[PDB]
Structure formats: structure tokens, C-alpha cells
Amino acid sequence: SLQLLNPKAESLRRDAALKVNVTSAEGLQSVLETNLGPKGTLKMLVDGAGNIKLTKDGKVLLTEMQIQSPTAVLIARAAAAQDEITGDGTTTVVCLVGELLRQAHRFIQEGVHPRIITDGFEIARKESMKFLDEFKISKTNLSNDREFLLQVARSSLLTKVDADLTEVLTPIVTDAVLSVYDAQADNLDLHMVEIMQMQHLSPKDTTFIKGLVLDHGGRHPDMPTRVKNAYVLILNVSLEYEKTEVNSGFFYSSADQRDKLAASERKFVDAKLKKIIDLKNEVCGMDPDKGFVIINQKGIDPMSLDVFAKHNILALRRAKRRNMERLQLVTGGEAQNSVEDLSPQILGFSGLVYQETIGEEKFTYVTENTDPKSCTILIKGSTHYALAQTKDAVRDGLRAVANVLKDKNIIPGAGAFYIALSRYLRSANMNKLGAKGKTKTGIEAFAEALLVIPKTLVKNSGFDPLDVLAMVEDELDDAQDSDETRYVGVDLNIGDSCDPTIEGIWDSYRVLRNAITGATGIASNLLLCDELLRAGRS
Amino acid sequence: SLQLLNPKAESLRRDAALKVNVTSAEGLQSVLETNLGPKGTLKMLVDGAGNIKLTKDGKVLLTEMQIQSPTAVLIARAAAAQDEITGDGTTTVVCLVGELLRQAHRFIQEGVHPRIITDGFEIARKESMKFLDEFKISKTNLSNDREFLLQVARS
Amino acid sequence: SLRLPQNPNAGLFKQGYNSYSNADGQIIKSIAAIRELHQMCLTSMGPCGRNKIIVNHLGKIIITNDAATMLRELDIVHPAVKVLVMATEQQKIDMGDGTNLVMILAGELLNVSEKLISMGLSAVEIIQGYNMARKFTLKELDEMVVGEITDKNDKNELLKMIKPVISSKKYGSEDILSELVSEAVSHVLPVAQQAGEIPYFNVDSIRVVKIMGGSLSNSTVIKGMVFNREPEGHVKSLSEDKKHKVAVFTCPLDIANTETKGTVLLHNAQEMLDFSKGEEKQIDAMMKEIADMGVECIVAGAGVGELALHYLNRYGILVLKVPSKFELRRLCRVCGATPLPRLGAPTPEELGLVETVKTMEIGGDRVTVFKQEQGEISRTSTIILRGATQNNLDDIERAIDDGVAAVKGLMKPSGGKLLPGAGATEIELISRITKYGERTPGLLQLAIKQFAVAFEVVPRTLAETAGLDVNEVLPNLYAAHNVTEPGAVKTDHLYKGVDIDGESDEGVKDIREENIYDMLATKKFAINVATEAATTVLSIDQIIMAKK
Amino acid sequence: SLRLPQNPNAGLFKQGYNSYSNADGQIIKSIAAIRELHQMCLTSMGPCGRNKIIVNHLGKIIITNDAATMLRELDIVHPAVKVLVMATEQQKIDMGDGTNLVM
Amino acid sequence: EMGRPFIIVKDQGNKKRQHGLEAKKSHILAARSVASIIKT
Amino acid sequence: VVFMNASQERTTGRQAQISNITAAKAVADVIRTCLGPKAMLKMLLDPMGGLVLTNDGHAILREIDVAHPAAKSMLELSRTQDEEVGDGTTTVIILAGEILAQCAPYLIEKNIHPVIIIQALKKALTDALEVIKQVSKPVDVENDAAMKKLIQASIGTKYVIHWSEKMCELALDAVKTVRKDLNFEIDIKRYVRVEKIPGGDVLDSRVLKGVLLNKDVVHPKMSRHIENPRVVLLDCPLEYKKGESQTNIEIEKEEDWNRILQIEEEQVQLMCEQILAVRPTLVITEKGVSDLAQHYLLKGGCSVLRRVKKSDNNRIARVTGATIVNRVEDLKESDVGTNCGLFKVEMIGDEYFSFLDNCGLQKACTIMLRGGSKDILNEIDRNLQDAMAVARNVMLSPSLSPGGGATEMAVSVKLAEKAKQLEGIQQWPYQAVADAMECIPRTLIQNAGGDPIRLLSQLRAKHAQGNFTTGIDGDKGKIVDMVSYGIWEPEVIKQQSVKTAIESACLLLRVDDIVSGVRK
Amino acid sequence: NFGSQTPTIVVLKEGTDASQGKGQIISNINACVAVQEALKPTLGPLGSDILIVTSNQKTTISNDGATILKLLDVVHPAAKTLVDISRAQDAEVGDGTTS
């Protein structure tokens, strides 16, 4: 009856739209299921411009590839929102949504109405949240031990690159925090670390720096590259005027005023430079090994470069907006706009400042600080995609170690949490039901659908997932009567079980909590949508 | 590697071909799903020539309507041949073939090889023949019971 | 998000195949598709019904109000409409009467079914509601019958049968059209009362000849068949009377030719000189035996050579050409002759009797008069139909066939079994089925009560086409049926019916004086076909079409 | 049996996207594709190596045996070749010697 | 017109109709063209 | 000639009436599955690409382009129900679509003139409002526990019924915060702020009184946590103001150009001194802020926020109590925001968020909704607006009417008794409304999987016993009264649904012709 | 169900005209009056004649109502009734076909 409204309008009702939601989610899952696990496949994104991007994360894949199917758009927007807050779980949510639909679609053909199916999802999900509190283990972060942070950070890097580069990047992402902590304030910000993209050495030769690194080099040759003692002066004012707000001009009566009107603009430039030179010599005069460095956010007049060249002052222009807040944390100084107010107290301190020339550009390196409140990570690569592949591995590793400090509870990984929910959701007894036979249908579909995560890991390794999970159920049966608590994981090497706590594999709290809740809403709305309609004016 | 053998060719294999037999047989069974049973739906066929075919027989639906999918062609020739010799079973075979592909498709995604799945079909089918001997009920034609022929004809 | 999946895995069938099911309001669209052609036949119902013009692809125009004839030239698309189209054609062939009733009744059963489906009634329960109500309907038709035709032929009694049937088709003048058809029926009846023989009648015996020009009042009834023919040798008024002896030959008149390689063989000039005079003596010897028997007319079934037509003009023998077959077959039934293929002397017992053969100008061309007289009665009489337009001549020919088909209804059953006309048949069934719906417990009473509501279309159609308000006239008619039956017998209130124009307010007293009645044998098959036509549409849950 | 099912995944992603995966091709197949450009560098290696003429869409002709210079002016649709092209670009930028050995 | 095509005779737009004084003027001038040819 | 260039051909008579009724029925037929607690969902595709998945009646109609001219009037009926009330937009089209469906076999069959039917529809509309008024009972508007069960009426259909226990606490404090004494509470949706934050959990939410801004601080030294915040709203930008007269300065002496830049720096410092007179802790402006005015406010500890939405400034003035003043010379201690507290900037990777907590009766609140995805979060936003709209009509009038099939059937029973007593030409169109009120209770059974034949047959027999509280269950389909389960809806929702359907039915029945091609 | 199009079934084949409304029977009246317009000046001994040229370029001059309608090919259904009465009047009496 839709064509009577519009001739070009189309629709698919009841099972016509139901087959779309099950197939489109299964087709999208089949592509992204091969990326789950350390043995997962590597996708190469090639656009019309010829750019090559190698990443195993579903956030970049779904962003570069436009999805025509409307059903998979909900999964892409759900996996995108999962990467925003938790920085992880893109592939996990995609694999859960498609599995919740296929398991529930089998009961629909048996005569089960989708309404009671959605009831079994919400009741079983609330019981999983209660089990999540008992299954998680609280940790003490006051000791700041390295061994605990290395194993958690390595687990996220094993899903990106091989084990050779993982061992190199593991202490880097572990050192990504270090001196940044607060006991009372609880505020933790990962935007203070800088991601540098440059081609130098090899991707495995990168190292961590304890201080800020800038991409701007010395504008004048006489500016000393290496400075033992430097006082960073933050200047947000532009020394070179781009334009005057009020329109004005210079009208000279005689040619003698031409050089005078040109010197009139020299007074305002020298007025800002007069207080800067007096600030350097204010501390101590004729003092070797002590330099003075200015980092400016706006442009610097090339004419004024010779003013600082005689005093051996390093100047940097066109700094990033996020760089101003980082100068206070690293150098310990204070952000200043104009030069009207200066003092040695607001100046920063650095133990080593040097610059290196890579290609046609020069980069500024600042390190050796007393109590630096921020740091940076230098990402080097041998090609174009090496900068994008390592960056996606670090950014996904930053959010992993952040949840450890934000939440002291750590949940073991390697599919140990999904297997534990299988036996718990089989029989709920009289605890939570709400109906006779109506609710138990949706709970059974949600319980067997959580086993796709451990089975997908085995399929990427080339083994039999049914044989791996067979020995898992046999161990959990004997562990209950032996009065011993054991966490059974999945090992992809020999095709046997393992212990995630001993093997060093753990998962974040916010990633697993938002994955179950996020995938439940996506799969529920698709089961509750019986019609797919398209209408509008072209 | 087929693009090197032929300039223009179309092929689908493994997971692409696995969805061919499962999905195509699912759409064919759904047409005859409402057909099976005495309360089943009634379908009318009208071609471009003006002829009208109104019947509940699944064989007329397969012969009159062309099928582009090659998977259902194997099912259509099997369902038609069932009605030829036995006069019945057109919609029954379609419901058996289409459903057995989907029931076995869930384990194919689990990593089970298709050969050991089909090997279990013959083992389970041979037991249906041994059970068929004890399941059937013997009837003697020497009684010449008319009521027995009435109830069978009404099926 | 930009483009839909466009029904994936739809490649199982060709792109021209479409699936339509009772769900998604398509069963309502099928009922709504009936109302498009239903209102076309509503204005054509009754004596005030309006004829329709339908132009085919060849340019032929047939103007008729008959629902069975109009649906022939129309191209039908919707499949369930063809169920209604082919249902009206069967009623015209079988009983030759009640064609517009099957079209209207089967269309109203689907209209009242739209409310039945909306209330949740399954297609199975709706079919059982009409089948149980139809069986009670056919039983009440035999209880409400009044009067009988009794004797086969009567001057007055034939005005109560053919006349009310032809009143709806080209109303015009009443007694003019009724006398022309009623006269031709009395000629084809074998009569032979008290003999105990089984009566017989043929619907193809009476033939209608369409002749343009003149007026309807100038039409007459001819006991013989009338064709357009030009006599070859001469024309004869045959005033010498003493009737005639006529013979009919289905084979042409000519020298018998070998079916394989007919060839003239002449060895010498002696055989060539006698070859020209030899063929002249063959026809002379064959035609002499026919002329000696007193045969003044010979009917030929094919082309006759010129050598054979020469000796036929010598003895003054007329020549008639009867092409094809059926035209010659009905000629022998008039004179009672038996054709024989040979050219020899016919048997005197197989010769026919025709008193006069005349050739006069009627519509501008020469027609031959086979008309019979009082004695030596003949069968298969023809009716000369004069009209100004050829379009009126076509439907009146079918209007006469409706009266001829009504004569067939006087043979197979025990009698005529006249029913109250003017829509009084369908109105009385409303109060009887309403009481029948209450006597049946359960949920099946919903379809039974609505089955009697569909009978309200007959009084509403006759009132709407008459230029009267259906809201004022129809409830005033139930006042006669709302008083049921009194404490005394002899209740004449069953004769109340719907009146056209005039003073309105019901009227025409009892229809017994009006003499318009209906046939019981027609209403039996009219309800059965119309019910199965609507049942077939409701019994189809899914409709599949090809190429469109 | 005339038309293929077209697969359900045809509606997923777009028709312009092409897929090469394990068992779907590549796997020493695409390795045989770069042998055309690999043989190009084999003839240019050594003091007896052969120079190659390359005409860019702009019309400028650059005749050299350097693999880093030749692969720069060539427009190559095959993506995995760019992995080898960008590998030779670093050899020229940093060390500046041995570009033919890397390819 | 009321919105429906009105065609009395086939080839409606092909055939033309002349009436009134213009129909008589075209007939006289048609004879004058033939007359001036024959008068010479 | 062509005469009229617009639809020279005309379709009039019964052909135009069928096209208007058939197209109007198709509008209600698609949303039949959208009614009830078991109702399904509908997905829509706009030409922009944004996907909208909801069961709401209005959201489906306005996003579908209908080529039928008369069927577009059915699309705007939900806008009347949404703008005036916001609840019951689905029942309006189902009722209005059933009227024309029931009124169809009259002009074609009974040949009754439309105006004759219109006179019957207006008389049936007056009697319908009296039946709804009689079945309505007053309740306490100050009872918090009673208003929680009333909001669950529209929630039972929506997917948020799982969070309904939490959702009622969010919508209750939202309406109570913005309302004030004066036409009674005169609450307006514009004062309620609903912010959509991707990610998080739906079970964890809180009602925040204030304005949630996504803008970061303009300077790193700016304190993100203030114990006693003071908000001063300024519409004038802190950047140097330029005159619109396009003043051109002719510079002659050498000290003229250097003085212009100094005066520009003196006025920016002067405008900061006018602000520091009251010593505000916070500064919020709707325009850009220059880098020179940032340093002058560092000594006073003035946190500056730039590029704030224009409508958000009016919402800040309600919570903080500050008065908006454009010029810095008129700033006084009375115009400074007071009683505000709990100013903190929480660190989230996506955006920087600022929190405000209040201690002239008009207030405002910002509800932070955390969903599982951006598209589901758009659904909770729409479900929260419809949940707060139910509490509006409860606070306007104490009248409360039953729902769930009890109100619709209570009217049809009263219309059946008066119909037999009319005995006139208007008796037939008067019975059309009685059968039109049956679509809503019949739809609830078809979506629940029950048998509408046996349930509706015994349902009418219950209303004849003298009780109007008998409804239809959405799950089991029981005939049990609605007093036990507690379904109740404001009378305004029932009145606006009946009034709109009657006024819309009379509009389409008066259209005897459809013409196009005008191109105004 | 076999496709997302789901075409709407039309009762009559494409190309069929419409009817009912207002003025459908009036269209048949104006068709006969327009044909009458040509035969009116041909009535009476002082009447005029009509020149008709067919597609074969056959010149014919006739004031007779029967002959004029034979030259032109009338595709209008209602206007052909005037042709039948003109040929029927000419067949029997032969005069008065114009009247």
C-alpha cells in the first residue's frame, strides 16, 4: 500500500526486512571476524588516490569504506562510538551484533515472536553485569609496578603487529604515562602525549622521550642547536603583524619621511623585543652554557631573527594550539601572551635542548627535566603506512592502560569472560524470569551467542574451535568440586587452554561493559524492525 | 585465477558458494512453506499469454515459473521427479532439502567439514529404513474393506 | 543508506514475476479492483439500465448493457477479476438469463467481505459462512415460488415469460418486442398434446436477421429462413401455387471429377468431336430425372458450373447457394428434407414442401422468402429485425436470444416456476437468512448475516437507476416485510417490489397485475456461480503474476 | 540456471571495491605480477645495466637506471608495488646509495 | 475541450476546412490564375 | 489554445472520493504495527543518508514523501498532535484513517451527501467529548508516586520500558525544575535541555540543573574547578571592536602609527578592568575572544568561554541568575550570577564538558543521556521528550482518563444507544464513529497475537455492565480492567486525538476534484 | 514479495480512456452537433455543397448526408450513429438523409 503514496517508494515488510538484518550483519561480521586476535588478518585500504593503510582495527576500516547497506550502518556507528570512549572494542562489537541476530533468527523461524526475544536479552544482560562485579579482580596501583603494566599493555599490541615490534613498543606505551598521575583529583588526560610522524631509522628502532619534541627547527643558522640551560619563554603574540584592524595608510610630504615612516613601524617591533632581551640578561650576565629559547604559537618576523641571532636565542614559530598547555607541564613554565609582564619565576627549565636535521626539515628536541608533568612518543616508520599502522596501535594502547588507573579492577582476557557467561546463563531458576517459556527463549539465544568470541580466535589460528572449547568445559566442571577458583583461557599456539593471569592477557573494564550493552541495543532494534522503507524527494 | 582463463566470467566459491545453496533453497522453501497442509495457502499463476493455473500443487509452480538460480533447478528437478513416480511428495522434498541445508549450515560456520556432515546423513537415513519396517502396518487385501480406501483417499 | 538492499535473494525468479498475498492490504486492493468494473455494470442493471460502448482493437463497436457481452471485448489484467469475468460468461451460455445478476451479486459479496476480514475472520470461516447460507438460500427459493406455466404454448402465458426478460434489454415498447419473439416460439414447438411424447426445443432454431432501415414497428415474423441471395437464371414469383417439391444437395452440381489428376484424354480426332457434346448429355440425363419428379427448386452447397445451370433454366428450376454448413443444415429442417450426395433422382419421401418462394426488396437487396403457411407447419423460423442503426440491431439480436433461452427453461425442469420480480426475490431472502443467522450458534453468524446484506444491492440499484433516493424508498419497502404474517392466511404482501420513476413511494400495488416475474431455474444457477466466484477470490491467499 | 545469485554480499560495501584475500587469489599470484617491474630493475643493475626511458604525462623524459627515480615517475595501479616503490624512496632520501639493491 | 482528445474524423490535423468569404475568394483566384494563363 | 494549462482533464465524482479514501487508508495501514507494547519498529532513509529508526507516528510521517496530494494532509495531522501535546500521534492517524475507511460505503452505497455526514460528525464529536469527560477521574497532581505511573503509559510502548524505573526519575525532576507559578506552570520544552553524549550506560544517568557546554577553556592556566563560581554573561566579544563606518586614518607623524596599536591594547585592558570591578570567577561570551584579553584576566582568575550558543546564554541566566548585559560599563554585582556551585570540567577524550549545579522562579536543567550508540541515543532523546509531555497535561488539569482500549470502547457503546433513537437520515453517518473507535482496541489485539473476534465480542458485553475501566492487555490480551495494571492517560491526549480525526475527515470528504499543474 | 517494487495492479490495460465524472455524455452531444454544423447549410434548394478530398485525392462534391459521411472516416463511437441513420434512410426511401 506504499506505492499509492509515492510511485518511487519501496519497502520490505515482516520477514522481507528480517532477512536483510540477519544477512547484512553476517556479511559485515564475516569480513571483520578475521581481524580478531593476534593471528588475525591484515587489511590493506586503497582508495582512488593511491593511499595505502594497514590496520587490523575496525574503526579505520569502516570509516574509509562507505557502507551502502543501511543495516550495517548501525553496526558501524556503534563500533565508532565504542572506539570514542573506550578506544577499543570495534571488532568485538561487530562480532557480537551479527551473532546475536543469527542466534535469535533461528528461534524466529520456530514461531517465536521478536518481542519476547528482546526480553531475554535485557534480563540476561543485567545478570552478566552482576557477574562482572564478582569476576573482576581489584588491583593496587599505588605501587606503580612495571611488570603489571607491561603485560597489560603488551596484550593490546599483540593484536596489532608481530611479537618483534610488540616487545619494542611495549615499554613505550607503558612509559606513555609515568610521571602523570593524581591521587586525589583522579584526572587523567592522554592528550598531553604528542604523536610525531616522521621517517627515520626503522619502525622497530623508535624510542621513548621523557620531554616534549617539536617539529619546528631553527630559523637562523647562528642559533645554537644544543643548549645546556634554556629558559622557555611562551609568547602567544605575533611579532610580525599580518594586518591592521583599522584601515590606515602613510602619507608623506617629502621623500625624507619615507625612511622615517618605515622606521615608525620599527618602534612597535623593537618595543616588544626590548623587554625580551632584558629578560635574558636579568638572571646573570656573561654566563656561558645558559641559553634562552622562545616558542611562539604565531608567526615570527624574519626581520627579527637577526635580533635573536646576536644573542644566540632559539626561536620557534607556528606552534600547535595543544602545544601551549604542554609547555607548562613539561618545562614547568607559565603561558604568557604579551611581553608587558616578565620574570624569572614564569620561565621554564630544561636540562638538554638539541635539534636534529631529518631530510629537508629540522625537529626540536627537549628533554632532561626535573619533574616533567607531560611526555611525548616519537613514532618512526620506514614508509607511509608505517606511521598510520603504529599510530593506530599506540592510540588503541593508550586507552588500555588508562582504564587501569581509572578503574583498579582488571578483567582477565583471552575469552575467559565470555566462556564464564555461558554456564551462568543456562539456568536462571526462579531468580529473574517474568514469564513462563517466553523469557527463557531469548536467554538461550544470548547465552550461546557469547561463545563466538573464543571460537573466532581459534578460527584465525587455523585450529578447531569445537575441540578447544571441549577441554574448557571439562576443566570448569572439576574446578567447582575441588574448592579452587581457576580462570580458563584460550591459547592459540598449541590449541589448548591456559590461564589469562599467568599468560599475561587481560581486558579493560569499560571495553567489555560497553560491548555487551552496546551490542544488545543494536541487535534488539534490528529484531524489532519489521519494515525497511525509503522515501524522499530527489 | 579464472579471470586469466576467460576474459569475462563469473564464479563464487567457498563462503560465497556456501551462501548460494543455503539462501536460494531458503527462498524456494518459503514459497512452499505456506503451501503444505490442508489449511495451506492457495496460489494462482497468470502468464503473459492470459492462461490461468490455480492449484496447490508445488510441481505446477516450478514448471510454470522459471528459476534463474541454479541451486533450485536441482531441487525443482528432484521435486518434479518425486511426483512422477509416486504422485506425491513435491512440496515434501523441497521442505526437506531446503531445511537440511540450513540445519547443517550452522555447523559449517563452526569449522566442521562438509564431507563428515554428509556422511552422517547416510547413517541416519539407513536407520529410517530399518525403523520403517517396524513403523509400517500390514494390511490384508483379502478383506476388501471399503472404509479403509475412503480414509486414505481423503488424505 | 543511499540505496536499499532491493529485496536480496530475489533472483530465484525472473524479474517479471511478482508476488501478491492477502497480507499488506492486497486482498483489499483485489476487492477494490472489483469495484472499478462493478460500478460499470450497476448502471446497466434493470429496464432503466444504461448501455455501454466498448471499442476493440479492430474498430468494431458493440453497444450493450449485458455484463457477459461487455467483458468479452475488454482486456482484463487483475487475475481475480478474470474469475468474475468468466463467471458471467457461463451464466449466459447455460441458462441464457441472469447475466447481470451474477456480475453484481459476486461483486457485492467481496464488498461486504472487506468488513468481515477487517474484524479478523479467517478465510476458512468466511467460506463456510457463505456455503451454509447458500444451501439455506436455495431451499427457500422453492418455498416462495408461485404460479406455473402449465400448458406449453398460450397467447397470454408467453407474455409472462419472454416479455419480463426482454424488458431489461432494449426496453423501448413492450408489446412490440414481445409479440415478435412469442410468435416464432409457437412455430418451433412440436405440440402433439395428449401423445405423451417428450418435448424438445432448440435455442439455435430461431434466427435473427439484421436489416438496416425502416422502423421497429415494420418488423414481422417469417416462418421460413431469410437470406440475401441473387437468383442466377431468372426470378419467379411462383403464382402457379399447388405448393412445390424442393430438393437439397449438399454436394455441388457439376460433372463428377476424379479426385486425382483429372485430365481430358483424346487419342484421335474421333473422340474429340464427341467430347463437346458428351458433357452436355451427362447433365441433361441427370437433370431430366429431377425435372420429371416435379422439383422446382434445388439447394446447392457449393459452386455450380455454368453447364449445369443451363438445363436448370430450361425447366424453370430455381438455384440456391448455401455456403459453409450450418446455413444449409437449418434449411432442411424447414421443409423436412434429407440431403443425399448423389446427383440422381431424389427419393420422393425425402422431398420437402414449400408453397411460395418470393424475392422482394427490404433493405435494398434481393432476399429470398422461405416463409411457410398455416398448414404443413415448419421449424426454425426467423425474425426480420428492422432498425435505423446497426448498433441497436446487435443487442436486440442478443435480447431475442435471451427470450429464446427462456423457452429452454420450460423443458428440462417440471415447469416454469415463476418467482416474484422487481427485486422481490432477493429482498424476501434477507429476512429469512437473518432469522437463519440467529438459529446457528457460534462465530459463523457474522458471515451469514452479512450474506443477506449483499442482497440489498438489487433494490438499491433499481432505485438509483430510476432517479429516486435510495434512503427514502428502500426503508419504506421493509414496512411490508416488517409486519411478518398475520393471524389469517392469504397474504399478498410478498408481491411488493421496487418501482421505476412515476410517483415513486413503492407503488404498482402487487406485481401480480404487472405480470413481470422471474425464472426459478435462472436464480438457482445465478446464486451458485456468483457465490463460487466470490469464494474463489477469498480462497486465494497469494496471487502470482508474470511479465507484469 | 541462467543467472548467478550475485551473492548477498554484493549489496554490502560498493561495486567499486575489489577484494583479494587468502585462497581468493594473491598467494604467489600477485608475487608473479611484480616480476614485470622486477625484471625492469634486473636489466638496469650493474655497470652493464640498461637505462629505461619513461615519458610522464607532462612530457618530460627521464633516462636513468636508478630504481628510485624510475618508480617515482611511473603511475602504478597495483598497490603492493608501492610498498616496494616507497621502500626504494627511503634508500634515496637517507643513504642515497643502493636503491637498485633494495628493489 | 474539457481535457480529452476530440477527433471526429481520422487524420484530424491533416485535413483543413474552408468556409465563409475566404472560401469563395480562394475559388475565384484559383480560376483567375488559370484564366490569365489561357488568355495569353 | 489548450485553455487551462493546469490539469485540463479532470477527475470528479466518485472517482475522486475513492482516491482520497484509499490514499488516506494507506497512511494508517503502515503504522498499524506501530501501536501497542509489542509494536515493531520502522526504519527510514532520507536523501541525506541519516537513518531514523523509531515507532513514533509523527517521525515516520514527516520523513516520508507522499506524491498523493490528499494523503499529505494525513502527514500533517501528527504535527498537530506533536506540537500541541506530543503523545498519541499514532492513534490519531489510525482513528482518522478508520473513519474514512468506515465512511466510504455511504457516498458510493447510501448516496448520502458529505455535508449531511459532516453534520453527524460534529454532533458525534460533541457527544464523544462528554463520554470522555465522564470516564475521566481527577487525581492528585502533587503526588510524586502517582505521576511516575502516568509517565509509564507512553513508555510501555517504547523500548525504554526496561529503564522505565530509571527514566521516570529523569523526566519527573525535569518538568518540576522548569515549571513555575504565574497559566499555571506554563512549562515549555525550550527550557529543558537534552544533551546527547555518545557512549556510556543508560542505567547510569542523572538530572543536572545547568547548561552543559562542549567548549574547552581558552587558556591552560584557567582553573577547571571552582568552589564558588560566579557567572557573568557578555554578548560583546573580547576582541578589539571595529567601527562599521569604515574609518580611514591618515598617518603623518611617526608616532601616530605606534600610538594606534597602543590604544588598541589600552582599551582591551580597560574593558578587562570594567569586568574585574565585580571580580567574577567565570566569564562566558557568545563570540570570539582575542589573545590579548586572555592575559589581563589571568591575574583576577577569570575563566573565559567563547563561541557559546545564543540560546544557551538564556538558559545560563535562568540557573545562575545572572543578567545579560552587552556593555561592560553597566556590569554590577546584581548582574553577577549567584548561588551556582559545583563547577568542574570532566576530562573526556571526545570533548571537554563543563558542569553547573544550582543551589525568578524559572529554572533550567540539562539531562545527560548516555547510550550504546549515536542512533539509539537519538531514540532515547525522542522517548524522553514524549515522556515529559505526558506530565505536562497532568499538571495543567487534574483530569485523568483511562487508556489501553477502555476509552475508545466506552465511546462506541454510548454511540450505539443514541443511534437507534435518532430514526432519521443522520442515523447512518452517526454509526460510523461508533465503528471507527474500534480500530484502536482491535489493533492492540492483532499486535499481541490474540483473537480479536472473541475478545471484542465479550468486550462490548462488559461495558454494558456499567464499568468503563475495562481495557485490553498488551501482553496476555486479558479482559481484566485497567485499574489493576494502572494504565492511565491525560484527557487532553484523548481529546486532541478525537478532535483532530473528526476535523480531518470532514476535509477530505469535501474534495470532489483533484487537479495539478498550477506551479504557483 | 518477489521484489521491492511491488507494482500496483491496474484494472484496465494501459491506453484505455476514462469516463463518468461530469461531461462524459456531453462529449457525445458536441460530437453530433459539430457533424450537424456541416449538414445544416446543405438543407434547402438554396443550400450549398461541401467539397471533400480523401487521402487518395479523390474529389467529391456532395450535399447528401449519406455520401458526406461515407467519404470521411468517423472514429468517434457516438458520431457513427449519424452515419447508420444516413445510410439506412438512403437505402429505403433515398431522400431526407440530411434532414
UniProtKB/Swiss-Prot annotation, chain A:
PROSITE patterns to which the protein is assigned, alphabetical: TCP1_1, TCP1_2, TCP1_3
GO biological process, one term: chaperone mediated protein folding independent of cofactor
GO molecular-function terms, A-Z: ATP binding; ATP hydrolysis activity; ATP-dependent protein folding chaperone; unfolded protein binding
InterPro entries: Chap_CCT_zeta, Chaperone_TCP-1, Chaperonin_TCP-1_CS, Cpn60/GroEL/TCP-1, GroEL-like_apical_dom_sf, GROEL-like_equatorial_sf, TCP-1-like_intermed_sf
Disulfide bond positions: none
Compartments reported by the entry: Cytoplasm
Keyword ATP-binding in annotation: yes
Top-rank taxon: Eukaryota
Matches recorded under Pfam families: Cpn60_TCP1
Alphabetized UniProt keyword annotations: Acetylation, ATP-binding, Chaperone, Cytoplasm, Nucleotide-binding, Phosphoprotein
Family classification: Belongs to the TCP-1 chaperonin family.
Function as written in the Swiss-Prot or TrEMBL entry: Molecular chaperone; assists the folding of proteins upon ATP hydrolysis. Known to play a role, in vitro, in the folding of actin and tubulin. In yeast may play a role in mitotic spindle formation.
Quaternary structure, from the entry: Heterooligomeric complex of about 850 to 900 kDa that forms two stacked rings, 12 to 16 nm in diameter.
Identification of the protein by name: T-complex protein 1 subunit zeta
UniProt organism field: Saccharomyces cerevisiae (strain ATCC 204508 / S288c)
Gene for this chain: CCT6
Swiss-Prot record, chain D:
Compartment(s): Cytoplasm
Covalent cross-link Glycyl lysine isopeptide (Lys-Gly) (interchain with G-Cter in ubiquitin) as placed by the record, residue numbers: K14
Disulphide connectivity of cysteines: none
The organism's place on the tree of life at top rank: Eukaryota
Protein family (similarity comment): Belongs to the TCP-1 chaperonin family.
Function: Molecular chaperone; assists the folding of proteins upon ATP hydrolysis. Known to play a role, in vitro, in the folding of actin and tubulin. In yeast may play a role in mitotic spindle formation.
Assembly and oligomerization: Heterooligomeric complex of about 850 to 900 kDa that forms two stacked rings, 12 to 16 nm in diameter.
Protein name: T-complex protein 1 subunit theta
Organism listed in the record: Saccharomyces cerevisiae (strain ATCC 204508 / S288c) (Baker's yeast)
Full-protein residues shown: 2 to 104 of 568
From Swiss-Prot, chain F:
Keyword rRNA-binding: no
CDD domains xref list: TCP1_gamma
One Gene Ontology term from the biological process aspect of the record: chaperone mediated protein folding independent of cofactor
ATP-binding recorded as keyword: yes
Coarse class of the protein's main subcellular location: cytoplasm
Keywords: Acetylation, ATP-binding, Chaperone, Cytoplasm, Disulfide bond, Nucleotide-binding, Phosphoprotein
InterPro entries to which the protein is assigned, alphabetical: Chap_CCT_gamma, Chaperone_TCP-1, Chaperonin_TCP-1_CS, Cpn60/GroEL/TCP-1, GroEL-like_apical_dom_sf, GROEL-like_equatorial_sf, TCP-1-like_intermed_sf, TCP-1_chaperonin
Record PTM Phosphoserine, positions in chain: S245
Disulfide bonds, paired cysteine numbers: C359-C365
Top-level taxon: Eukaryota
Subcellular location: Cytoplasm
PROSITE patterns linked: TCP1_1, TCP1_2, TCP1_3
Chain's role: Molecular chaperone; assists the folding of proteins upon ATP hydrolysis. Known to play a role, in vitro, in the folding of actin and tubulin. In yeast may play a role in mitotic spindle formation.
Name this protein carries in UniProt: T-complex protein 1 subunit gamma
Lineage of origin: Eukaryota, Fungi, Dikarya, Ascomycota, Saccharomycotina
Curated annotation (Swiss-Prot), chain G:
Signal peptide (from-to): none
Cellular compartment(s): Cytoplasm
Highest taxon above the source species: Eukaryota
Record's subunit section: Heterooligomeric complex of about 850 to 900 kDa that forms two stacked rings, 12 to 16 nm in diameter.
Function of the molecule: Molecular chaperone; assists the folding of proteins upon ATP hydrolysis. Known to play a role, in vitro, in the folding of actin and tubulin. In yeast may play a role in mitotic spindle formation.
Family affiliation: Belongs to the TCP-1 chaperonin family.
The protein's name in its UniProt record: T-complex protein 1 subunit eta
